[PDB]
Paper text:
The DNA damage response protein [name] (p53-binding protein 1) influences the cell cycle dependency of DNA double-strand break (DSB) repair pathway selection. The localization of [name] to chromatin also requires that it binds histone H4 di-methylated at K20 (H4K20me2) via a tandem Tudor domain (53BP1TT), while BRCA1-BARD1 recruitment requires unmethylated H4K20 recognized by an Ankyrin repeat domain in BARD1. We show that a series of water-soluble small molecules targeting the methyl-lysine binding cavity in 53BP1TT function by stabilizing a previously unknown lowly populated autoinhibited homodimeric state of 53BP1TT in which the histone binding surface of H4K20me2 is buried within the protomeric interface. Our work therefore identifies an auto-associated form of [name]—autoinhibited for chromatin binding—that can be stabilized by small molecule ligands encapsulated between two [name] protomers.
Our structural characterization of 53BP1TT in complex with the related compounds UNC2991 (Kd = 3.9 ± 0.4 μM), [name] (Kd = 6.8 ± 0.4 μM) and UNC3474 (Kd = 1.0 ± 0.3 μM) revealed a similar three-dimensional (3D) arrangement wherein each ligand not only blocked the methyl-lysine binding site but was encapsulated in a cavity generated by two 53BP1TT molecules. This consistent burial of the histone binding surface of 53BP1TT by dimerization was unexpected. Since the homodimerization interface in the crystal structures buries the histone binding surface of 53BP1TT, such a conformation would be autoinhibitory for chromatin binding. Several of the 53BP1TT residues that are close to the small molecule binding site had two different NMR signals. This is consistent with loss of symmetry observed in our crystal structures, allowing interactions by each of the two 53BP1TT protomers with a different “side” of the bound small molecule. Taken together, our data demonstrate that like in the crystal structures, the small molecules are buried at the interface of a 53BP1TT homodimer in solution.
Numbering used by the authors:
A (entry chain A): 1481 to 1603
B (entry chain B): 1482 to 1603
Write the structure that this text describes.
Amino acid sequence: GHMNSFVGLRVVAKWSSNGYFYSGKITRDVGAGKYKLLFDDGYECDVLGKDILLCDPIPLDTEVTALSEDEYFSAGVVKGHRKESGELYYSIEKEGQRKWYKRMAVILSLEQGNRLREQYGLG
Amino acid sequence: HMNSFVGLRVVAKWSSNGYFYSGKITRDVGAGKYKLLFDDGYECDVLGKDILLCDPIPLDTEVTALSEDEYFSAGVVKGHRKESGELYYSIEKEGQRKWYKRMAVILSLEQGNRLREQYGLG
Ligand SMILES: CC(C)(C)NCCCNC(=O)c1cccc(C(F)(F)F)c1
């Protein structure tokens, strides 16, 4: 049947308006460097392969941004990841304190995502 | 006598066929538009009719609760509480209740259309 392809892979992919990379999954390999991306909020749009990071999970010791109520730019460092009942969580350290976050709350600024492009950029 | 909703939390639709997502009004732009900061950091202008001035989402509202690989899971708001300054909703689905963080509780296109009359800023 279907041969494994990039379809169905979980990734973090760049949002053009603000340059941040958000958790999502590739739903279609459209061709010519374009992909259809389903972000974890249910929104789907086209994203270029150069703007997709093949991170599932984001690796240890990565600088990331962790969303929480009324906080949009909280930088932290990945210190672990675990699955709790089919859901990925990240352990994020900030100034010697740790909180566990669901996958979709962990995003990357442009600068944070660029640190991962060489190793993890799709195309 | 004047009301200004800048700084207040809302649930709002930014794309023509989109869901309504948790956010905050950051500016009254004019022409029936407001600048919206969604909880994920995306900021854009939104028509007032697509903004629901709800915080918290009311008891017994039909909602959609996000979780990994769950995009359409409908449920009903049955309670809410703050844990360390963060709102969580108790969501009932098929007679069982689970707690979800605010940003994960969204309204489908139709679920939001249905509150526009009472809570919409149109
Ligand atoms: C930029 C982007 C298209 C992803 N969102 C647009 C603004 C509305 N979405 C949210 O506020 C939201 C809610 C829950 C989860 C997430 C996600 F980060 F996981 F995608 C996002």
